Amino acid sequence: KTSCPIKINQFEGHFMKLQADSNYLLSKEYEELKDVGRNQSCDIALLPENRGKNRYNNILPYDATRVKLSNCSDYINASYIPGNNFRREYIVTQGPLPGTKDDFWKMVWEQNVHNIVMVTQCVEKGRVKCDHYWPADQDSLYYGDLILQMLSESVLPEWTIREFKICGERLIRHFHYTVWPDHGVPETTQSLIQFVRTVRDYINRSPGAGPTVVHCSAGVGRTGTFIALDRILQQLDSKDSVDIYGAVHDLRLHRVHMVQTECQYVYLHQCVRDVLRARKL
Numbered sequence: 001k002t003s004c005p006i007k008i009n010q011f012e013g014h015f016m017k018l019q020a021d022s023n024y025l026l027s028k029e030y031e032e033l034k035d036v037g038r039n040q041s042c043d044i045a046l047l048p049e050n051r052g053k054n055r056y057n058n059i060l061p062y063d064a065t066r067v068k069l070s071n072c073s074d075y076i077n078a079s080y081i082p083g084n085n086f087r088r089e090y091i092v093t094q095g096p097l098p099g100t101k102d103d104f105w106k107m108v109w110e111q112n113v114h115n116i117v118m119v120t121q122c123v124e125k126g127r128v129k130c131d132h133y134w135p136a137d138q139d140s141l142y143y144g145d146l147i148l149q150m151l152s153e154s155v156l157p158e159w160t161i162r163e164f165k166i167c168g169e170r171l172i173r174h175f176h177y178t179v180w181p182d183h184g185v186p187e188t189t190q191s192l193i194q195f196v197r198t199v200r201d202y203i204n205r206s207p208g209a210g211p212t213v214v215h216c217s218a219g220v221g222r223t224g225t226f227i228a229l230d231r232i233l234q235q236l237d238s239k240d241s242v243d244i245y246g247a248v249h250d251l252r253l254h255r256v257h258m259v260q261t262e263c264q265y266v267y268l269h270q271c272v273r274d275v276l277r278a279r280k281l
């Protein structure tokens, strides 16, 4: 039932218990989350006009929580997701297709988005996962009625940070994490922890912003794991308990498959374990 809050001083032992007997109890917990939100329809996403707008025909937003474009011309594959501190803290979306990248940027403009987090590569092992939907160098480009120009790019080993100016009628930061395999996990907990803390620092510096956009290719697994870690890290900094189950449960109420593999659910626990070890020390 919805929430499994663990005292910080009990977390190390809780996670051992979950891991005992080849993850027996961790598997049981993750399976329970499988049913959350499952009563909800995705009729709009299924409309024939919309077929070409979904990257995966079986990963679609719930009607109840989908993001609507101004006006079916209102459709984009994206969902609002609550966070630690407000109900539309994030918009999660699929990786834009060549034919929906104009819709993606229209959404970014309309929802006052200032920060976009991308956790897939464009092509992974030669499988296309996401269109390269921003400009390639400093040359400007139109996307629908908007013009976008890259102002800066900072390449680091595990992520790249870009800043764009957008003209419509704003500066947008793009955080591109380039070392997270689809259906898998990063090589270390430290890498994603550092990435999340970095993005949260920028979000905290973004007065006035609408939701933060987070996406991978389908916008469920890496996306959901990123959001869950962002929420649980804030819990750790402010609170005496941590509730990984409850975070993933709240995500699942809002979009299908959030935290898409059991290894990703394990990884959330390993990140929390690693942070608490460093702290209570």
Ligand code: VO4
Pocket: 120, 182, 183, 216, 217, 218, 219, 220, 221, 222, 223, 260
């Ligand atoms: O591209 V994601 O499979 O991690 O939803």
